[PDB]
Amino acid sequence: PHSHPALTPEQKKELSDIAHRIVAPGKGILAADESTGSIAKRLQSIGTENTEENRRFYRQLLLTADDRVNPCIGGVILFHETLYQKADDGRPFPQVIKSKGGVVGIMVDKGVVPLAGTNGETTTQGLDGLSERCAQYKKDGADFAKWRCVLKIGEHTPSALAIMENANVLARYASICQQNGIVPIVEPEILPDGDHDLKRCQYVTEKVLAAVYKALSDHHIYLEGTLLKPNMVTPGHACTQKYSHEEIAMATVTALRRTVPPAVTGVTFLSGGQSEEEASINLNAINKCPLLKPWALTFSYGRALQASALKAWGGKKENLKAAQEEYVKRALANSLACQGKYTSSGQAGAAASESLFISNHAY
Amino acid sequence: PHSHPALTPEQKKELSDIAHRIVAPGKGILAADESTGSIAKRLQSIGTENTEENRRFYRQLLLTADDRVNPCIGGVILFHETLYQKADDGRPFPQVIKSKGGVVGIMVDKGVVPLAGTNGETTTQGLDGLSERCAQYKKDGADFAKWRCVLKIGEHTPSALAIMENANVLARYASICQQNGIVPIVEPEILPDGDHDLKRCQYVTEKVLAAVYKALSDHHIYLEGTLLKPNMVTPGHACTQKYSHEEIAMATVTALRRTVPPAVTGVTFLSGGQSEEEASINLNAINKCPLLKPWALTFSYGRALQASALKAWGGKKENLKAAQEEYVKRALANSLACQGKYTSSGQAGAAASESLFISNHAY
Amino acid sequence: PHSHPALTPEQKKELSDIAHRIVAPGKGILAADESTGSIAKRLQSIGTENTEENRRFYRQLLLTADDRVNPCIGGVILFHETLYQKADDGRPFPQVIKSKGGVVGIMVDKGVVPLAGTNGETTTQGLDGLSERCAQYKKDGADFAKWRCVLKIGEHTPSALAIMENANVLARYASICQQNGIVPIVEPEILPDGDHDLKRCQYVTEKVLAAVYKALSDHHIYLEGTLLKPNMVTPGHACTQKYSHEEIAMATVTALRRTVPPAVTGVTFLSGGQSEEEASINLNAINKCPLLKPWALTFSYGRALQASALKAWGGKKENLKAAQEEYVKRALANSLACQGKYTSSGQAGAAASESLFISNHAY
Amino acid sequence: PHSHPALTPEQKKELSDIAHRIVAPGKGILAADESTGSIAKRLQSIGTENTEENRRFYRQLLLTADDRVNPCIGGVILFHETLYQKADDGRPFPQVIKSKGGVVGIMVDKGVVPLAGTNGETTTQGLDGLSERCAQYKKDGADFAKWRCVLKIGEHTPSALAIMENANVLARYASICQQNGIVPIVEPEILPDGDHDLKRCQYVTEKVLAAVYKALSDHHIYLEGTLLKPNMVTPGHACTQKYSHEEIAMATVTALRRTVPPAVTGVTFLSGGQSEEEASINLNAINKCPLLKPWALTFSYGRALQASALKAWGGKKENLKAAQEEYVKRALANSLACQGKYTSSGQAGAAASESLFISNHAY
């Protein structure tokens, strides 16, 4: 084949730098990119009703935590609106994040659309005018993007089509991102739904990440300028078998060692519906695993950094400080976790709510 | 693999029915899907302003030609605007087209975008929200769609990536279209720009189409409810070698025979810069080839059907009929060609001057 | 991509001719390429020891059937032993077959081997030193070869690995073949085992062939110099649903129309455990399907052309004439079948015999 | 996809162990797999006849080395003949190797065959009956195999086909090996021929490796029981650009980092026509490269470990020890190089190579 460099030595430089700053030792990613609909559900869980002001206030709450958070938070992924909102003192949100030492992230995909002829599988849209939006985003203080692709494990899922198609689109988004000085977080999300064991999930994970990286190679993606946001290898939510956090750290680290090349700056694990405590404990064991990890293994948590804070806040403006505290605790807990310096109480405790719902809550 | 029917027998029936109505014996397709920018170039050449009224009137001009055209036109591809425009009688253009026995088509892609790391190669965007647009377009009288993917021949083109990428986007588009009852026209266009000869073009056409069809298989596209709009195998527009139309017809038919499966209802060739007369002659000879053709071999012309009409229109009502007649002449000339009944007219007058470069100065 | 002529006009010529002559109207293929072990199993049934003499005589009994078979069979696939054997008159078997108007075939594959990591799947070996063997076979009067890959429909079969593998190995065998002036018959045999219905078989068959022809394209295969020896789309050998001959005919032709490009000279269906009469009846209805078939649709039968002959012989020389007749009559019946001119006393397809799997005993 | 364990936990364990022994810190591989034909040319340069004994004596010379190489040689690759030859003391060669601490290897490929339609490209044969060959070789002390694949760089090479095909064939060989408890060494040798620079080769290497690993994943290969035998990223032999060993080391490790998953136990580079010193120097620079190397970077040298010793022999049986010493020094030198503790420099001024191409004479 004949090379035709998509990026210049300088473009590659900026990309690597940004990536290495987000995953810097002890730092992780705050997933604050809940869409108006996602947040609407969560605000109502405490009794609060959805509204722009409430969203701004809530996001501010997380973003204006005391400086203890600074060494823990390497980046914050935001939703389109929050990016253009301002703190009570009139300082635009990206500036607050930036002054705290982090890089501003943006959710760029436009949701998942079904694939015809599949067993309910999907692909993700958002490629239209992506360049134009990536140009505005960076100009407005965005250094990285996030694009989510969902995969599901079943009797005949994920299919060859689902895997190859989803990989191919993630590769496209990534390519576009780099061209505009944007670092792309490739999120090949395999859903925990099902009763499949640890082996199945691990096996699936290996297969999908294979396709993912081969695709990136075909599309000429600069891996040093990318972050991987995969799922931790765990059993299905309906699996009757209990596994030790070590088995999870094992299955996870192994899948990665077999599919993720060293050039990848880092891996930011998603909480995937795990309780706050559990999320940190697993991330700890993953960094406590004897195997050789060529890249950072940190977090990119959403609910696993907001649960207790949301509850403690309860919409009560007076509860601002009490709510921010919970946020801070989880952040520090995970800061240690991505280093293997975390200690828990063998379970979960307060951070153990959530609850598994099977065909019960439509709303 | 495990089947999961994308379409029910009823959906397939409709699709196969529509695709058959467009490529019926002796009928072709009128491409009137120029966008505000494309049509502008054509209006300014004759001296007419690029106004909505002017575009509307010219579009009407062709869409209201005498009934002799009814048997020649199986479908008319319209641009979003023209689709929602009314004729002087207050009737919506689609109703006007379908009353005259024509099937209404719509252009749904959003243009070509660069592929990073390639040699000026591209891909096509437009998939975002396509289902909602296709579902709605169906509600407004459009029965078929059109999507264009541009490929190019060069020292290192088309590349594996460009081929794989465009082939995949086309299959995505089709899948979506068929889910909304819309018949997809795959348009894997291989540009004639260059100095390459017949052999090379043919060779590339065979690879592009093989890839295109395998992609449709992976995507479970219903081949019976599809039309393939390709380029005719011709040498480059700078090649130094005269080729008889017979050779062109041989190379073209051979290429299609090697890659386009029989189930494909019809092939609608595009002019691609050929003179009106040349488009008719090559299409005529294609149909005259001794090789077995298990699919309709007709046209889908733009400039090759409109060239003389635009010129004979002058941009004023006075030449309304004078122009319509040129269009009528060209269509029935091509109507005969897609059956092997056309007989070369010759060359003497009423030709079209596509841009003034080395002519006149003070007129 | 760029061209590098795999074959020259003269080579393409020779191949196209050889292939067309074998599938000439009314003509089919006799598949007597049973390996020493395979034939031993058949001889054991009639009470005849597996002696090279016995093998030579039986093969002779088939090849020396009077001139009535001449217009019926255009090709004879032999085993390495048979190719070098001589008939009673001292003339070599290929000369015998040749004088009778047929072209000699030879099996070249080395059997199937397991694909580790698959649900008991296989792939086929035989590529090592193939070129050398093909050059020898050619010098010895062999003008076409046979390579068989086995695939199976089941719970998680056939898988992507198997499909990709066999499709690719066939293309290797094919390419080599064309280089040595041998016409390759590509045989992607999908076993009829299992309780899978007709629709399942059609789907898998469609997908397998789509992979096959994409593979041939990648390897630059000359489709006009190739034959396809597929399985008919029939229900599983344990299906409880009863199907008519017209249904299997429609399913087989539809599948083919969706995968086999017009350029492919001919399709030589295999028996696949079908009865002698059932095979010919199915072949006939297939050629009586209203759907346009761009290529020849003949047979390449083994047991479906030998059973009665082999059975009547009983290892007794004096039964020679009776045995050969059972054969001649079988060839004659199929000769009409490939032309769609086969009708038994009743002007309808004969009813089945056992059909146990449809009875109440299969519940 | 669905998990179907190709190897039991103990099978994986055996492979991991073998592969790890071969590339333990400080150890490398001795490449003595020169076929009878190839070894002949070498013997001709030292005025020696290529006979049964002469070859055996030469192989003995290397294998019956002073125990000082015991910590240097992790494994030795033998040709089929040598595997069944015995040393003067009456011990079969594989016995000598084992006792001295090294694991016995055997190259199993049967040479390269031309790919049709390509610009003189190739693929490798050897898969036929490979399984039974492995079961026997294993029986006779073999623990690891070798299969070479050649890919040349040029105007349009390597092609997508050569990459796809060679990758698939390497994976087929790998699978068959692991099935018989043999560690397979994947060798996609990218020829250094031509005037292409450093960047072109790195690019091609990245592409080739990307395909190799995807194919291994598709075939369900156990990465922990495999070794890659790639070329170092070095410019073309006809290139006219001076590159320091530091530039070579950088380009090389980065390529592996972007493709080779950390699970790959080790990488045993090949000399690629390099001189003994140059190979030791480049390997040293490669190991002392600042970037994180998750796999063992060692050697597997033929000429670069025999050159001087071979010359010293010059047929004279007396020269035995003097020649054996030159080999010991080379082994020790490289033993230090595979750890990045080798005193050197490398300047094309004193002891230079064919620097003619860089010379003004090449203008």
Swiss-Prot record, chains A, B, C, D:
Explain what the record says happens when changing K146A: Loss of activity
Which GO terms label this protein's molecular function in UniProt?
fructose-bisphosphate aldolase activity
Instruction: Tell me the residues on which Phosphothreonine occurs.
Output: T8
Q: Where located?
A: Cytoplasm, Myofibril, Sarcomere, I band; Cytoplasm, Myofibril, Sarcomere, M line
> What's a Pfam family in this record?
Glycolytic
Indicate the annotated site residue(s) for Essential for substrate cleavage.
Answer: C72, M107
Give the N6-(2-hydroxyisobutyryl)lysine positions (modified residues). Answer: K98, K146
Q: Gene3D superfamilies per the record?
A: Aldolase class I
Q: Which reaction does it catalyse?
A: beta-D-fructose 1,6-bisphosphate = D-glyceraldehyde 3-phosphate + dihydroxyacetone phosphate
UniProt cross-link Glycyl lysine isopeptide (Lys-Gly) (interchain with G-Cter in SUMO1), position: K41
- Where on the chain is Deamidated asparagine found, per UniProt? N360
State what changing E34A does.
Reduces activity 14-fold
Predominant cellular place of this UniProt entry's protein: cytoplasm
Give binding positions for beta-D-fructose 1,6-bisphosphate: R42, S271, G272, G273, S300, R303
Name the chain's protein: Fructose-bisphosphate aldolase A
- Organism of derivation: Oryctolagus cuniculus
Organism taxonomic ancestry = Eukaryota, Metazoa, Chordata, Craniata, Vertebrata
Task: Supply the gene name.
Answer: ALDOA
